RNA sequence: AGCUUUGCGCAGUGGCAGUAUCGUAGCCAAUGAGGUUUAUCCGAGGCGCGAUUUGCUAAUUGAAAACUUCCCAAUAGCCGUGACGACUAGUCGGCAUUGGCAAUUUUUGACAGUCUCGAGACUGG
């Protein structure tokens, strides 16, 4: 009724917000080319 | 032979450099420039105009500051699961990837500070 048998969460996935990771990255700005391209007028992807 | 003077040239230490350093082809000037001192004396440039190479390096703006770039795709531990295989439903080896790996036996920290002569003691109020 306690809800027995002492537990040890090793390897087992834990319950909740324990798994919280957060990565702050910001990549370099990929701009497009306009002047002196040799390519056709609309942008490349 | 040594010392030494004067002028010039070279290099070096240092100092100075817009009341400084010069050019002058224009004029004047020791056949005298310029002189308030000392003038029956002194003695050198004066007035104007006009200027004040080269190499190296830094920094800034600028898209670009002058010596022959960006982007996409893919390659470069263990517990389960799927097959393949091997050995007797079970076990083992390698391969593969479609969940997980901070709660006492390990990989998410009983560590940190102190003191004494390789060895121990104290504290975490």
From Swiss-Prot:
Subcellular location: Nucleus
UniProt modified residues of type Phosphoserine: 5, 8, 26
Tree of life domain: Eukaryota
Modifications after synthesis and translation: Phosphorylated in vitro by snRNP-associated protein kinase.
Known partners and oligomeric status: Part of a tri-snRNP complex.
Assigned protein family: Belongs to the SNUT3 family.
Task performed by this protein: May play a role in mRNA splicing.
Name this polypeptide is given: U4/U6.U5 small nuclear ribonucleoprotein 27 kDa protein
Species per Swiss-Prot/TrEMBL record: Homo sapiens (Human)
Higher taxonomy: Eukaryota, Metazoa, Chordata, Craniata, Vertebrata
């Amino acid at each position: 009724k306690l809800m027995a048998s002492f537990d040890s969460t090793k390897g087992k996935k834990v319950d909740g917000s324990v798994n919280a990771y957060a990565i702050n990255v910001s990549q370099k700005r990929k701009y497009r080319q306009y002047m002196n391209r040799k390519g056709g007028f609309n942008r490349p992807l």
